[PDB]
Amino acid sequence: DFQQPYTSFVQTKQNRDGLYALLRNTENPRMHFYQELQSDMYCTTITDGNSLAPFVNWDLGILNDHGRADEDEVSGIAGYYFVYNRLNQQANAFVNNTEAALQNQVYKNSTEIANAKSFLAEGKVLQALAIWRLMDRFSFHESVTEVNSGAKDLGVILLKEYNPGYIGPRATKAQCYDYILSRLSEAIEVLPENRESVLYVSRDYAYALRARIYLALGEYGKAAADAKMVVDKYPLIGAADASEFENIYRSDANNPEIIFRGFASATLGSFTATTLNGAAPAGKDIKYNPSAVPFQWVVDLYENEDFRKSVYIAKVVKKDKGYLVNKFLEDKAYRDVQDKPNLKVGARYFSVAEVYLILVESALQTGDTPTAEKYLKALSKARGAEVSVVNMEALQAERTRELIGEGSRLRDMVRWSIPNNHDAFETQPGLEGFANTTPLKAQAPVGFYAYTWEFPQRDRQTNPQLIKNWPI
């Protein structure tokens, strides 16, 4: 978007739809595969041509300046940083131009004014999401040890106006989190209690997003309170077997757990997300050749009865000798031909199973055992494998089982003081000669700085006020 304030409701709504079209390609599963692969869950395969290995084996020399953000490619660490700043920039343009349009009294009636204020609240949630996704990967956790002098308590460059080419320093962690949380807070007051559409920002998604941020911050009482606002509003998938689970889970339209998602059809909004499964169409069947596969400990986390053991992960590597992360396989509603797989999925922004997990973790931390027991037993049972002992260990295992492929594990390891024990893990025995037994290039102990990414090299070169994260 641009710098000219809006002159009509139609113009405002068109730019609002423009912002959701951008969100679909930003808050996308393809942007979270990098943080996913950097966790302690995967090993590379012989199919990997040093593409996923820098994240998997913690190759610090490559990760330092990883990715691209130019006219020909937007990928990796540099691509992630670019798309979330571009999302923040366009949400700024939308928010400021709607605020100006409201101040200039350009709307025709009270309905246009009320709806424009509501759109403005949706924009604020997207400003909070963009700045938080930058905080999540480019600001350090409190537990970090050695860091570049002055970076420990720094956030990100906090820019509130559509201003490309801006040269400024990083704001503090407190300043960035105060802005994220004030945005969500101001939005929750305007957005109606009941969700208008699964395709648009709602008060339900604002509570879910804030619950996620509070959990990440270790604010368990506040995470539990936000989680309780939406946890009972979305029912879990009701499935008698794995086949019924797959057909509902893989359906954007029919899955009752989705709170917010991006528009998708066979012609618009659909995209392949084959990084983790290395899947390709082969007539009416699907060929698999992954570049990274989970370790045996990840496979053994699931009971054979668990519906996610043939959906989230699938024994499809080399026909049937190993397991592959098949969460983003397809939504058959986005096929061009009914019987021909094209492996197209839609962008999902929040689902109730993540809210259940935020609630269980936060309840265990605040000593609310009945709440932890109710929601952990409910989620695991619906998945076909009920947990028998509800404790922090069972939450850690069920959270890992549920959010595999979604880039949660790297964050979870840091919050749970889990070092990367990659070198000690047993690879899948049926994948001998395919799965790599490559050791970490750099060890990742509790508090290691490289759990946080370095700011892209171009940005560090053009902005002398930007303080880098990594020492040495």
Ligand X SMILES: O=P(O)(O)OC[C@@H]1C[C@@H](O)[C@H](O)O1
Ligand Y SMILES: OC[C@H]1O[C@@H](O)[C@H](O)C[C@@H]1O
Query: Per CB under 6 A, does 373 bind ligand Y?
Result: no
301 contact, one of ligand TG6, ligand Y, ligand X, none, CB 5-8 Å limit per kind: ligand Y
Q: Do 322 and 230 meet the contact criterion of CB atoms below 8 Å apart? A: no
Query: Per CB under 6 A, does 178 bind ligand Y?
Result: no
Q: Do 444 and 451 meet the contact criterion of CB atoms below 8 Å apart? A: yes
Query: Cβ closer to ligand X: 297 or 470?
Result: 297
Query: Cβ closer to ligand TG6: 24 or 170?
Result: 24
Distance in angstroms (rounded) separating the CA atoms of residues 291 and 299? 17
21 contact, one of a copy of itself, ligand X, ligand TG6, none, CB 5-8 Å limit per kind: ligand TG6
* Beta strands at 271-272 and 344-345: parallel, antiparallel or unpaired: antiparallel
Find the binder of ligand TG6 among 17, 142, 153, 393 (CB under 6 A).
17
Query: Per CB under 6 A, does 297 bind ligand X?
Result: yes
Residue 397: CB minimum distance to ligand X, A: 8
Residue 181: CB minimum distance to a copy of itself, A: 8
Query: Cβ closer to ligand X: 306 or 330?
Result: 306
Instruction: Using the rule CB under 6 A, give the single segment among 85-93, 174-182, 314-322, 324-332 that binds ligand X.
Output: 174-182
Distance in angstroms (rounded) separating the CA atoms of residues 145 and 471? 11
Residue 269: CB minimum distance to ligand TG6, A: 6
Range 182-221, binding ligand Y (CB under 6 A): 186
Range 277-316, binding ligand Y (CB under 6 A): 300-301, 303
Find the binder of ligand TG6 among 74, 159, 199, 248 (CB under 6 A).
199
Contacts of 223 by beta carbon, 8 Å cutoff, 6+ apart: 211, 212, 214, 215, 358, 359, 361, 362
Query: Per CB under 6 A, does 46 bind ligand TG6?
Result: no
Query: Per CB under 6 A, does 268 bind ligand TG6?
Result: yes
3-class secondary structure, 44: strand
Interacting residues with a copy of itself (CB under 8 A): 158, 160, 171-172, 174-176, 178-179, 182, 185, 188-190, 297, 387-389, 391, 393-394, 418-419, 421, 423-424, 426, 445
How many residues sit in the footprint of ligand Y (CB under 6 A)?
Answer: 4
Query: What per-residue string of b and e applies to 141-170 under the rule 16 or more CB within 10 Å gives b?
Result: beebeebbeebbebbbbbbeebeeeeeeeb
Find the binder of ligand X among 7, 182, 197, 243 (CB under 6 A).
182
Angle at 265 between CA 262 and CA 266, to 5 degrees: 140
Find the binder of ligand TG6 among 123, 262, 278, 290 (CB under 6 A).
262
Q: Do 194 and 209 meet the contact criterion of CB atoms below 8 Å apart? A: no
Residue 237: CB minimum distance to ligand TG6, A: 22
Tell which residue, 148, 156, 157, 146, has the closest CA to residue 469. Answer: 148
Residue with tokens 């592959």: 324
DSSP letter string, 74-88: EEHHHHHHHHHHHHH
Query: Per CB under 6 A, does 179 bind ligand X?
Result: yes
Q: Do 312 and 405 meet the contact criterion of CB atoms below 8 Å apart? A: yes
Phi, psi for 261 (deg, rounded to 5): -150, 165
Query: Cβ closer to ligand TG6: 76 or 269?
Result: 269
Tell which residue, 189, 25, 166, 19, has the closest CA to residue 94. Answer: 19
Task: Write down the H helix ranges in 172-274.
Answer: 173-190, 203-217, 220-230, 242-249
Query: Cβ closer to a copy of itself: 189 or 241?
Result: 189
Residue nearest to ligand TG6 (CB): 20
Distance in angstroms (rounded) separating the CA atoms of residues 35 and 179? 24
Residue 100: CB minimum distance to ligand X, A: 17
Query: Cβ closer to ligand TG6: 199 or 467?
Result: 199
Query: Per CB under 6 A, does 412 bind ligand X?
Result: no
Residue 378: CB minimum distance to ligand Y, A: 18
What's the sign of the alpha-carbon dihedral 254, 259, 265, 270?
negative
Angle at 325 between CA 319 and CA 330, to 5 degrees: 90
First vs last C-alpha separation in the chain: 40
Range 305-344, binding ligand TG6 (CB under 6 A): none
Give contact residues for ligand TG6 (rule: CB under 6 A): 17, 20-21, 24, 199, 262-263, 268-269
**Residues near ligand X (CB under 6 A):** 40, 178-179, 182, 297, 418, 421, 425
Footprint on this chain of ligand Y (rule: CB under 6 A)? 186, 300-301, 303
